[PDB]
RNA sequence: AAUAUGUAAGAAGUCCUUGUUACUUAAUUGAACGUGGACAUUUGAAUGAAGAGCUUUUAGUGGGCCAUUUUUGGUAAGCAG
RNA sequence: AAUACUGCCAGCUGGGACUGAGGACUGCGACGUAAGUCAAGGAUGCUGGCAUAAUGGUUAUAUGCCGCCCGUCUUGAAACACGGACCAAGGAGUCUAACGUCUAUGCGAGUGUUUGGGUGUAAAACCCAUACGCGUAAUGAAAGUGAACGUAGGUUGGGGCCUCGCAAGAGGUGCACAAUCGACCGAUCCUGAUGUCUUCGGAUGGAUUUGAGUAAGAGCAUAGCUGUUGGGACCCGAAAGAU
């Protein structure tokens, strides 16, 4: 024998994990995040875009739609830590956001076989974005200049300090 | 027929009555805290109304904290620090004030900062850093079971029984304070409040008697 | 295994201290004292104030 | 063996267990019993008192055959009779049939009297004997005769 | 002290058991009331430096 | 750093295991460690701690010492336990009937006990018949009767034997040992 | 004076009765050692004990030096003690 | 009347940092009429990307900070103290005799076969008698003498065991060991019984004496570490001396 023997053999079975005492309590949001407020996205495809916060999803994410006719952001979910809640708000009393949830934003069923070695918007996604935008635009236009505000993008200028700029 | 409920229900009934007698003990010890405080306030005010001056009773208990390291200590201070179980920096313990213990504090004065602890200081101390010496080990207190196991013969059934015996220095103070391990305190959170520690508290330093500012020092160390 | 601090972690603070629930409910750390109108004596007041 | 010595454990350490200051030399205190009266006087007074001096008178031409006198005590006297006959001789203590012990045959010159032979009559052949050994043999009922 | 302790133990068999056999040190003083009738507190000041020669 | 009141990392100074590689002794340690842990009687603790002992700390116990132990009143029916060896003795001429639990017996000691009606049992036979130590009597041999002990503590005015090869006149009987030549001890 | 230092702060001790002596006493007197009996709220000050006590064996070392205070010789010294 | 200051809250709450150790359950607790749940004896849930040089490692370099050249003698070394240009190999506490302490083993009042003999597969192994060594007796210079008044003594402490005891604890036995008071043995000194080759004997008794003693043996042999001594004696080194 090149190596003789290990006399004490560690057991090949795995012990079960201990019963963890961690419940998934629901997330409490910030006080500045009311459904119907305007947010600045701080990261992603839409960095600095002004978007309208619609619904807090049960994923802990935030269903936003800056209106797609206005700023080009679709009905998408973002994170609470990557947005900044501006003090001004919009009206969401007459909008249907009840059917947007976790499985609505599912990407695709992924296996190991059909993996993309090298590299289409859904017609249902466009139409519910439209009927969200029909309710959202009808109150955006009732106050002056807010449509121009959402179509603009936020940026930090020279000399402004985010620790003293109220958003 | 399997002996599950035959011992679990009896143990749960034993735990319920042990908690009930501790609850009324803590209720009794709580109510004597405000009466022993408010009569002292009323004795000061009654002496002021009578045109007299009320000498308050001298403090039966000091909390003593070792503030200087284990290097360059003369042997007669070094023996007393070991006898008071102050073996390292920010090691605290309770000392019952007698004439024998007063001259001990006068002998290790340039190495310790002692004062008169309040009830809030003591109960926060033993909850956060109270460890019991059981078979020469630092088992943390963490429930009244090991308090009853090692201090049940002196009537101390709980940590609040242990707290009350510390602040009101009774006949079992030697057994209770030796049960408590020396408090491994941290450094103070807001600093020591002085540029230099090793002058007297009268001289703008840290050691010596800080009589009622040991609460400000230890609530920062805790 | 792991030491949990009392005066935070109220379940550990309720494992100890059966009076802590009564203390929290009755607010015995912020109890109002009885109003009284005892006046200090003139001999104490003028000793404190003189020269 | 060599591999369990401390020389192998001292490999790497400079003085090999002998000290930097002391500098292990050939013979720093002398050779043998050197200076037993001058600089090892304290050793030869504490641990070996009696080393220096002529005590006693000289005995020219000592042969240990003249001083051949190994001593057998009375409690070891009954070891001489073998175990095949020892129980038959301890029981039924008879004056007529008494066990003779040729003490000289094993090679003990003198019988001493450390004590408590059983109350049996025993014949003891001796070159020498002590007074208390004879009195205890007389108390047991035995006799001592002398041989040479 | 032995004779006093034996006598105190003999009397503690009748009455006043746990008669404090052990010596206690000089305990810190309990609270007292210091009246001021005839004892109005006279004020004191530090003395000026006088050479006294 | 802490004030080291004593030596940290100090070993207990006692044997936690025998120094021997004796497999049968280690089996008896294994049995009596179980007995010391699982019985509240301190007999199994004493036998285990005596099983650890070395050869100079396990002196021989004569059968005359067994006979003197059984000569005590109320201990005639007791079992005498020697954690160590047992040798016989020609000093006694009547060994009483008893059961003796020893590690080793010499062949003379086995003869002296068996022919007296008694039995020589081992310490595992002891464990079977008496796990808590019912009516037992542990006997220890004379530890300080060893010839190495009379040279211990040698010095002036101690009454101890010096270390010496040849005992006699002209060997340590001169100055320092008598008053005629200088001084006596 | 200060500082430093010795002793004591009990169960190996206290109290009562009566046993030995070739010691002592004028003595059935004491001394020493005793036999019996009574001695928990704390078995006789405080605090600590981190285990206590004992024994063996042997290594290295037996050139020291510095600092506060006291201090000697010296004018003083990173001088000598 | 507020407010400052000091202090308390078993007051609430926000933001940050670091840590996630254990791996079925037990335990303490809280909320709920119970059922169960839980921030309650240590982190889980969801999601995304990549699946390879991405992360990590090695190595080189750069940068920030640190970092004196090692060995030795020394109170003190980076020393303007000494050795060292570099590399490879060799190179320094070994063996024996006699032992000491400790440990292991075998036998144990005995132990040790190996001087020798027989035998052998042949320097092995196996077996064996007589002595002898050391021990079981010491003490004295020697002639010599030579260790139980007792349950091998008494006292104190003493593990363990036995009896009583719901349990502390109390008695009895108390091994080892420690201290002490005795007793016995040898030596020294003193008194001197029957006796008698009338100058031998030494019984009995005793001591501010003494011993490396006894007082129900503990040793022998082997092996090992350490230590000692002798030898070259850890290595190296003289000036010399003699034939």
Residue F119 sits in a domain of what CATH number? 3.100.10.10
- Which nucleotides of chain G does any protein CB come within 7 A of? 4, 9-10, 13-15, 39, 41-53, 55-57, 59-63
| CA dihedral of residues C5, C9, C13, C14 (deg, nearest 10) | -150
In this structure, are residues C27 and B31 in contact, taking their beta carbons and an 8 Å threshold?
Answer: no
Q: How many CA atoms lie within 13 A of F69 on its CB side?
A: 22
Residue F181 structure tokens: 């030549």
As beta bridge partners, residue A63 has A55, A77
Determine whether the distance from the CB of C10 to the nearest atom of strand H is below 7 Å: yes
Dihedral angle at the C-alpha atoms of B147, B151, B152, B153, nearest 10 degrees? 170
CB B146 within 8 A of CB B137: no
Pairwise CA distance, residues A60 & A162, whole Å: 26
Q: CA D30, C1' H234: Å apart?
A: 18
Q: Of A75, A39, A53, nearest to A153 (Cα)?
A: A39
Sequence-distant (6+) residues with CB within 8 A of D98 are D120, D121, D122, D123, D142
The gap between D106 CA and H127 C1' (Å) is 26
Resolution in A: 2.9
Q: By CA distance, what is F5's nearest residue in B?
A: B82
**From CA A68, how far away is CA A147, in angstroms rounded?**
12
- CA F101 to each of CA A11, A93, F90, F159: distance values in angstroms, whole numbers, following the listed order: 42, 96, 21, 38
Instruction: Report CB contact under 8 Å: E40, C51.
Output: no
How far D127 CA lies from chain F's nearest CA (Å)?
A: 23
Q: Are F108 and F87 in contact (CB under 8 A)?
A: yes
Let me know if residue F140 belongs to a domain: yes
Residue at minimum CA to C1' distance from nucleotide H29:
C15
Q: Report the alpha-carbon distance of residue A81 to residue A43 in Å, rounded.
A: 10
Q: What is the 3-state secondary structure (H, E, C) of F20-85?
A: CCCHHHHHHHHHHHHHHHHCCCCHHHHHHHHHCCCCCCCCCEEHHHHHHHHCCCCCCCCEEEEEEE
Assess C43–E contact: CB distance below 8 Å, yes or no. yes
What residue in E sits closest to B46 (Cα-Cα)?
Answer: E33
Find where tokens 């006399």 sit: A7
Mutation target to probe the E interface, by most E beta carbons within 10 A, among B41, B59, B98 is B98
Instruction: Say how many Å lie between the first and final Cα of chain A, rounded.
Output: 74
In a domain, F92, yes or no: yes
> Does the CB of B178 fall within 7 Å of any strand G atom?
yes
Cα distances (angstroms) measured from residue B222 to each of B14, B68, B94, B190: 34, 18, 15, 11
- Structural contact between residues D75 and F64, judged by C-beta atoms closer than 8 angstroms: no
Question: Does residue B171 approach strand G to less than 7 Å at its CB?
Answer: yes
- Compute and round to an integer the Cα radius of gyration of chain E: 24
Coil, strand or helix at B154: helix
Element (H, E) at D124: strand D123-126
β-pairing, B91-96 with B61-66?
antiparallel
What's the 3-state SS for D50-97?
CCCCCCCCCCCCCCCCCCCCCEECCCCHHHCCCHHHHHHHHCCCCCCC
Through-space separation of residue B205 CA and nucleotide H168 C1' in angstroms: 53
Residue F73 resides in a domain: yes
Distance separating alpha carbons of residues A119 and C31, to the nearest angstrom: 70
Tokens 């006979």: give the residue: F67
Distances (CA, A) of F185 to D44, F21, F159, F179: 12, 46, 9, 9
Closest nucleotide relative to residue F78's CA, C1' based: H161
Measured in angstroms, the CA of E24 and the nearest CA of chain B are apart by 9
Q: Chain C within 8 Å of B46 (Cβ-Cβ)?
A: yes
CA distance A106 to A109: 8
Domain that residue F24 falls in: 14-145
What 3-state DSSP class applies to F126? helix
Between helices F43-51 and F23-38, what is the axis angle to 10°? 160
Task: Measuring from the CA of residue C20 to each C1' atom, give the nucleotide at the shortest distance.
Answer: H10
Nucleotides in chain H near protein beta carbons (<7 Å): 6-12, 14-15, 21-25, 27-31, 37-49, 71-75, 93-95, 98-110, 132-133, 135-139, 141-143, 145-148, 151-152, 159-162, 172-178, 185, 211-214, 216-220, 224-227, 229-231, 233-234, 237
How long is the CA A128 to C1' H174 vector, in angstroms? Answer: 100
Q: Find out whether B88 and B181 touch, Cβ atoms under 8 Å.
A: no
Query: Degrees (nearest 5) of the Cα angle B10, B13, B19?
Result: 140
Strands A83-89 and B61-66: unpaired
Angle between helices B75-83 and B99-107 (to 10 degrees): 130
Nearest CA to B67 among B165, B196, B158, B171? B196
Output the 3-class SS for B113-140.
EEECCCHHHHHHHHHHHCEEECCCCEEE
Q: Specify whether the CB–CB gap between B95 and F10 falls below 8 A.
A: no
Asked if E31 lies within 8 A of B43 by C-beta distance, the reply is yes
Chains linked to F by 3 or more Cβ pairs within 8 Å: B, D
- How far is residue B164's CA from residue A37's CA, in Å, rounded to a whole number? 55
User: Residue F42: which region, alpha, beta or left (left: phi > 0; alpha: psi -120 to 50)?
Assistant: alpha
Instruction: Enumerate the H helices of B50-118 as residue ranges.
Output: 75-83, 99-107
> D117 to chain F: nearest residue by CA?
F91
Assess if residue F35 is contained within a domain: yes
User: Measured between alpha carbons, how far is residue D87 from residues B195, D116, D138 in Å?
Assistant: 97, 17, 21
* Residue B141 backbone phi and psi in degrees, to 5: -65, -70
- Token pair 């978007």 is at which residue? A51
Beta bridge partners of B139: B132
Question: What sections of F106-156 are H helices per DSSP?
Answer: 107-114, 123-129
CA distance B40 to chain E (A): 9
Task: Give the span between the Cα atoms of B74 and B184, in whole angstroms.
Answer: 23
The answer to whether the beta carbons of residues D51 and D36 sit under 8 Å apart is yes
- How many alpha carbons lie under 13 Å from residue E15 in its C-beta half-sphere? 0
Strand H interface, D 102-131, C-beta < 7 A: 107, 110, 112-116, 128, 130-131
Coil, strand or helix: which one is F103? strand
B127 closest CB neighbour out of C6, C22, C41: C6
Q: How many Cβ contacts (< 8 angstroms) between chains B and E?
A: 46
CB F155 within 8 A of CB F98: no
Would F162 be classed as within a structural domain?
Answer: no
Between CA A18 and CA A28, with CA A22 as vertex, the angle to 5 degrees is 170
Judging by beta carbons within 10 Å of its beta carbon (0-12, 13-18, 19+), is residue B85 exposed, middle or buried?
buried
Is the Cα torsion angle B214, B216, B220, C2 positive or negative in sign?
positive
In a domain, F132, yes or no: yes
- Which of residues 43-62 of F have CB within 7 Å of strand G? none
F121 neighbors F98 (Cβ within 8 angstroms):
no
3-state SS, D10-43, equals CCCCCCCCCCCCCCCCCCCCCCCCCCCCCCCHHH
Residue B4 backbone phi and psi in degrees, to 5: -115, -65
Q: Cα dihedral sign for B82, B84, B85, B89? A: negative
Are C and E touching by the rule of 3+ CB pairs within 8 Å? yes
Is residue F160 included in any domain, yes or no? Answer: no
Please state, in angstroms and rounded to a whole number, the distance separating the CA atoms of residues A95 and A138.
10
Using CA atoms, how far apart are residues F160 and F152, in angstroms rounded to an integer?
7
> Which letter does DSSP use for residue B61 in this model?
E
Q: In this complex, is the C-beta atom of C46 within 8 Å of any C-beta atom belonging to chain E?
A: no
Nucleotide nearest to C24 (CA to C1'): H10
Tokens of B184: 């491994």
**CA distance readout (Å), A16 to A12, A81, F54:** 13, 35, 47
Closest CA–CA distance from residue C32 to any residue of chain E (Å): 26
Let me know the angle formed at the C-alpha of A51 by A50 and A53, rounded to the nearest 5 degrees. 140
In a domain, F170, yes or no: no
D/F Cβ contact: 3+ pairs below 8 Å:
yes
The structure was resolved experimentally with cryo-EM
E-assigned strands of chain B?
53-55, 61-66, 91-96, 112-115, 131-133, 138-140, 183-184, 208-209
Give the chain C residue whose CA is nearest to the CA of B160.
C17
Q: Which helix (H) or strand (E) holds B7?
A: helix B5-49
**Distance (Å) from CA F163 to C1' H210?**
21
Three-class SS of A53-122: EEEECCCCCEEECCCCCCCCCCCEEECHHHEEEEEEECCCCCCCCCCCCCHHHCCCCCCCCCCCCCCCCC
Q: Comparing C-alpha atoms, which of B74, B61, B58, B59 is closest to residue B109?
A: B74
**Strand G: which of residues 143-182 in chain F lie with Cβ below 7 A?**
151-153
| Residues of chain F with C-beta less than 8 angstroms from the C-beta of B69 | 1
Smallest Cβ–Cβ distance between F93 and the set D50, D53, D118 belongs to D118
Residues 6+ apart with CB under 8 A from C25: none
Q: Which residue is nearest to nucleotide H211 (CA to C1')?
A: F159
Are F116 and F97 in contact, with CB atoms under 8 Å apart? Answer: yes
Closest residue by Cα to residue C16 from B133, B117, B146: B146
Q: What is the DSSP letter of F17?
A: S
Cα–Cα dist B187/B89, whole Å: 9
DSSP F157-170: TS--PPP-SS-BTT
Which chain E residues touch B37 with a CB distance below 8 Å? Answer: none
Contact status of C49 with chain E (Cβ, < 8 Å): no
**Cα separation of B193 and B216, whole Å?**
10
Number of domains, chain F? 1
């Amino acid at each position: 024998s090149a190596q003789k023997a290990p006399k004490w053999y560690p057991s090949e079975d795995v012990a079960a994990l201990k019963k963890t005492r961690k419940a998934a309590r629901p997330q409490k949001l910030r006080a500045s995040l009311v459904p119907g407020t305007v947010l600045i996205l701080l990261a992603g495809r839409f960095r600095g875009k002004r978007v309208v916060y619609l619904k807090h999803l049960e994923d802990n994410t935030l269903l936003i739609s800056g209106p797609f006719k206005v700023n080009g952001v679709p009905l998408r979910r973002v994170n609470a830590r990557y947005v900044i809640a501006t003090s001004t708000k919009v009206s969401v009393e007459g909008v249907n956001v009840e059917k947007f949830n976790v499985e609505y934003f599912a990407k695709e069923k992924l296996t190991k076989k059909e993996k993309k070695e090298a590299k289409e918007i859904k017609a249902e996604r466009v139409e519910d974005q439209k009927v969200v935008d029909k309710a959202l635009i009808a109150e955006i236009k009732k106050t002056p200049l807010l449509k121009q505000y959402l179509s603009a993008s936020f940026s930090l200028k020279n000399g402004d300090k985010p620790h003293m700029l109220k958003f | 027929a399997e002996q599950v409920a035959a011992e679990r229900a009896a143990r749960k009934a034993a735990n319920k009555e042990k908690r009930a007698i501790i609850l009324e003990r803590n209720a009794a010890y709580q109510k004597e805290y405000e009466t022993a405080e408010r009569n002292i306030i009323q004795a000061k005010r009654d002496a002021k109304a009578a045109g007299s001056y009320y000498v308050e009773a001298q403090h039966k208990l000091v909390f003593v904290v070792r503030i200087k390291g284990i290097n360059k200590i003369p042997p007669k201070p070094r023996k007393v620090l070991q006898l008071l179980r102050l073996t390292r920096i920010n090691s605290g313990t309770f000392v019952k004030v007698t004439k024998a213990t007063l001259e001990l504090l006068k002998l290790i004065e340039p190495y310790v900062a002692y004062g008169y602890p309040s009830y809030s200081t003591i109960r926060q101390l033993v909850y956060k850093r109270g460890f019991g010496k059981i078979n020469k080990q630092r088992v943390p207190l963490s429930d009244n079971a090991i308090i009853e196991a090692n201090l049940g013969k002196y009537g101390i059934l709980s940590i609040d029984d242990l707290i009350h015996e510390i602040i009101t220095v009774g006949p079992h103070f030697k057994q209770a304070n030796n049960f408590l391990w020396p408090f491994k305190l941290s450094n103070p959170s807001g600093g020591w409040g002085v540029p230099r520690k090793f002058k007297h508290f009268i001289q703008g330093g840290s050691f010596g008697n800080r009589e009622e500012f040991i609460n400000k020092l230890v609530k920062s160390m805790n | 295994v792991l030491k949990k601090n009392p005066l935070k972690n109220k379940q550990v603070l309720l494992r100890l201290n059966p009076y802590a629930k009564v203390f929290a409910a009755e607010k015995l750390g912020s109890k109002k004292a009885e109003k009284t109108g005892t006046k200090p004596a003139a001999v104490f007041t003028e000793t404190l104030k003189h020269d | 063996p060599s591999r369990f010595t401390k020389t192998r454990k001292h490999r790497g350490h400079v003085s090999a267990g002998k000290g930097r200051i002391g500098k292990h030399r050939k013979h720093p205190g002398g050779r043998g019993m050197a200076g037993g009266q001058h600089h090892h006087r304290i050793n030869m007074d504490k641990y070996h008192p009696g080393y220096f001096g002529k005590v006693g008178m000289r005995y020219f031409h000592k042969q240990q055959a003249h001083f051949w006198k190994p001593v057998l005590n009375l409690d070891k006297l009954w070891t001489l009779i073998p175990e095949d006959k020892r129980d038959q001789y301890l029981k039924s203590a008879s004056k007529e049939t008494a066990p003779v012990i040729d003490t000289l045959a094993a090679g003990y010159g003198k019988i001493l009297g450390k004590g408590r032979i059983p109350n049996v009559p025993v014949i003891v052949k001796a070159r020498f004997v002590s007074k208390l050994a004879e009195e205890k043999i007389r108390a047991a009922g035995g006799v001592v005769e002398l041989i040479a | 002290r032995v004779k006093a302790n034996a006598a105190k133990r003999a009397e503690a068999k009748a009455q006043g058991v746990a008669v404090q056999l052990k010596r206690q040190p000089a305990q810190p003083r309990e609270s007292r009331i210091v009246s001021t009738e005839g004892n109005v507190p006279q004020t004191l000041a530090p003395v000026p430096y006088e050479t006294f020669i | 750093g802490i004030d080291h009141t004593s030596k940290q990392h100090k070993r207990s100074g006692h044997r936690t295991a025998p120094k021997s590689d004796n497999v049968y002794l280690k089996l008896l340690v294994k049995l009596y460690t179980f007995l010391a842990r699982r019985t509240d009687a301190p007999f199994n603790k004493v036998v285990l701690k005596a099983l650890f002992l070395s050869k100079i700390n396990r002196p021989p116990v004569s059968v005359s010492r067994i006979a003197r132990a059984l000569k005590q009143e109320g201990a005639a029916n007791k079992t005498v336990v020697v954690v160590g060896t047992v040798t016989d003795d020609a000093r006694i001429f009547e060994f009483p009937k008893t059961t003796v639990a020893a590690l080793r017996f010499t062949a003379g000691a086995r003869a002296k006990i068996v022919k007296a009606g008694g039995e020589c049992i081992t310490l595992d036979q002891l464990a079977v018949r008496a796990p808590k130590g019912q009516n037992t009597l542990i006997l220890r041999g004379p530890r300080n009767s060893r010839e190495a002990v009379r040279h211990f503590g040698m010095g002036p005015h101690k009454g101890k034997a010096p270390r010496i090869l040849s005992t006699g006149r002209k060997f340590e009987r001169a100055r320092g040992r008598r008053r005629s030549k200088g001084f006596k001890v």
